[PDB]
Amino acid sequence: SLEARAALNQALEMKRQGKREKAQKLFMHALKMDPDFVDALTEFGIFSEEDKDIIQADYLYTRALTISPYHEKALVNRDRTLPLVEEIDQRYFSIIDSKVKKVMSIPKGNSALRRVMEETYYHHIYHTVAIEGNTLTLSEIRHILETRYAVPGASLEEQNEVIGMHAAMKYINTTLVSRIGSVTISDVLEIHRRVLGYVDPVEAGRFRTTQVLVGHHIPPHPQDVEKQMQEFVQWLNSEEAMNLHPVEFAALAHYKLVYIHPFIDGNGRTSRLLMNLILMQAGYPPITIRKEQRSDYYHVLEAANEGDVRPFIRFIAKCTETTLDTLLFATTEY
Amino acid sequence: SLEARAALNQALEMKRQGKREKAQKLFMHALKMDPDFVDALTEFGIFSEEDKDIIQADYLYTRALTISPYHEKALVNRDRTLPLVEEIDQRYFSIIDSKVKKVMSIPKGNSALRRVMEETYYHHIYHTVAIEGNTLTLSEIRHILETRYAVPGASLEEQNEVIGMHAAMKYINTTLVSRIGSVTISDVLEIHRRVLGYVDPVEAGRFRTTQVLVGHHIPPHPQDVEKQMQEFVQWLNSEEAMNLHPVEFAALAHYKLVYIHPFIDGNGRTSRLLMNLILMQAGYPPITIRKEQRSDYYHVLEAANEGDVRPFIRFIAKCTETTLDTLLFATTEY
Ligand SMILES: Nc1ncnc2c1ncn2[C@@H]1O[C@H](COP(=O)(O)OP(=O)(O)OP(=O)(O)O)[C@@H](O)[C@H]1O
Ligand SMILES: Nc1ncnc2c1ncn2[C@@H]1O[C@H](COP(=O)(O)OP(=O)(O)OP(=O)(O)O)[C@@H](O)[C@H]1O
Ligand SMILES: [Mg+2]
Ligand SMILES: [Mg+2]
């Protein structure tokens, strides 16, 4: 492409000109033009290291080698950054584990903690539906679940989504948390049943029969969905997956489920519930993917489809840390 | 019982005294005291004939013989009334068939008719939920189904019941009406699924596992429910049932289903939908059991349990006629 090289050649000049803005947009626009443009990736990676964003740099070098495996400028930079980010990632998970041990060391009966867990429960439901486009407020959700009376000027669908979540959550907490290691299709179906039961009871708790598009992702064909779910379940209960880091295992479980997209709707909600199940079985608190992180959440998912899950694994880890911060703040406060 | 005979002996005296009130209450109160009091039944039957209520009289004579088969006063009166009401019942069904032929003779495309069918559709849903204790108005139901937005100050359950009905009705009309003669368990499950899906998706479309009380009726034990439903389906598709009068067949189908009470909730609604299916397959319009007829509806059901279904069959026939009157009034008007 002619216009692809134009933007990149314009980008380098601005960088070495001494731009205050830094012409980061010029680089982004180049890869907007052609995202598989090996030269634009490496040079953008080099630019990222100067701003001390080595993880972003490594991502770009990794993406370049999937396109052009024997691109030398990528290969030499990759070999340097490959083990460096491996360390940085490991170090981050140690920082998580430390904050988790602080939370785990607290006794369950602690009165200050249980206040926070009660308040943050309503927040959990808000964010998982809000990220879909649910327009219900926190106080509205509080009113719906406690009173069981509909709020004025809001679709019954949106209000049924809230009830579906609370049902699914109470089910998980009651039944599924107590059994560590072994999970089945039936378990996933029973979560989804309650998630999408009050909205669409016909399709609730069974696989889709039609092919769909999820953002920019094309999941396995309905005929292949069962086969994929059969493999997904095997992976969950495999020794490999047990030996993975809880946060990492929780993340990979999330992605794999939304990748398969076995249901017509409610795949994200159920995946995030399954994510939080995995964590709570491993002794971690249930984490929140906030409403505000929608764009980022989609970008890292898109990145995972193109063949690098690490950004998504980091995103889940970012959320985990943010949760642990919130709990330790409120618990220490009260 | 001493107090049972007291009221009855008091009743006869008042009747033959020449009471303007007629001491009908004295007779009712006697059978309130003891409903299996053979002497009170026969004498109340005799009293009913004087007011030209021979069907009511026959009922009482029939109830007496289940208790005391060889009670002479009942036996002689029964033998007289037995064929008389048989004629009266047959004559009523002829009066129905005539009014049905007037309705059936109208072309489907008729513009005046389709106005009525559209308006009365919302009435159908109102009455079937209103009779349960649903507190939604006609305009509220109209708003819920058209806008799909919840009305202010009404339980989500009540509003989900409305959506459940509309779903079940649209399903029946689309799928089930086109196949005359053959119905399965799966079909009944698929109706109930949509009826109770939006309220309780967990229990929607499957048999209850717990024994319950329905008014004053004890249905078959959960273990026996499947066996009863298996027999119920056989009866529906039997030649006997095809040769029954549509209104009668529709009625018996209703009662048999609510008798079995296979689901935890939503047995009446589904039964009334199945009732109206049977009618529409036989070429009759779907009929309405009004909200106001709740007490009567329960009394005739209780009577059917004690071992005389005829009152219920008449009640359904009464509703059918009332429907046919409403249609022919509105159709002729417009
Ligand atoms: N590019 C992508 N690749 C894989 N999965 C994706 C991608 N984009 C989005 N997803 C996932 O698919 C979900 C959308 O599918 P679906 O509508 O079945 O889920 P939902 O639960 O209805 O929506 P939400 O999770 O927002 O409530 C998203 O929530 C997300 O988790
Ligand atoms: N004595 C009785 N014997 C047999 N069946 C009865 C008796 N009394 C009531 N019923 C039936 O059982 C139904 C009640 O059971 P259930 O609650 O499962 O039905 P529902 O659909 O939830 O209630 P409704 O029909 O009022 O909406 C009544 O609607 C009626 O049709
Ligand atoms: Mg969705
Ligand atoms: Mg009920």
Numbering used by the authors:
A (entry chain A), B (entry chain A): 103 to 436
What does the paper say about this structure?
The crystal structure of dimeric FICD suggests the existence of a hydrogen‐bond network, involving the side chains of Lys256 and Glu242, linking the dimer interface with the enzyme's active site, impinging on the AMPylation‐inhibiting Glu234. Mutation of the dimer relay residue Lys256 does not result in large conformational changes in FICD. (ii) The dimeric dimer relay mutant FICDK256A displays a clear MgATP density up to and including the γ‐phosphate phosphorous atom. As noted in other Fic AMPylases, this Mg2+ was coordinated by the α‐ and β‐phosphates of ATP/AMPPNP and Asp367 of the Fic motif (Xiao et al, 2010; Bunney et al, 2014; Khater & Mohanty, 2015b). By contrast, in the active sites of FICDK256A or FICDL258D MgATP and MgAMPPNP assumed AMPylation‐competent conformations: their α‐phosphates were in the canonical position, as defined by AMPylation‐active Fic proteins lacking inhibitory glutamates (Xiao et al, 2010; Engel et al, 2012; Goepfert et al, 2013; Bunney et al, 2014). As a result, in‐line nucleophilic attack into the α‐β‐phosphoanhydride bond of ATP would not be sterically hindered and the Nε2 of His363 would be well positioned for general base catalysis (and EV4C and D). Concordantly, the RMSD of ATP between the wild‐type FICD and monomeric FICDL258D was 2.17 Å (and 2.23 Å for FICDK256A's ATP). The disparities in the manner of FICD‐ATP binding are well explained by a monomerisation‐induced increase in Glu234 flexibility (mediated by weakening of the dimer relay), as reflected in the lower melting temperatures of FICDK256A and FICDL258D relative to the wild‐type dimer and localised B‐factor increases in their respective crystal structures.
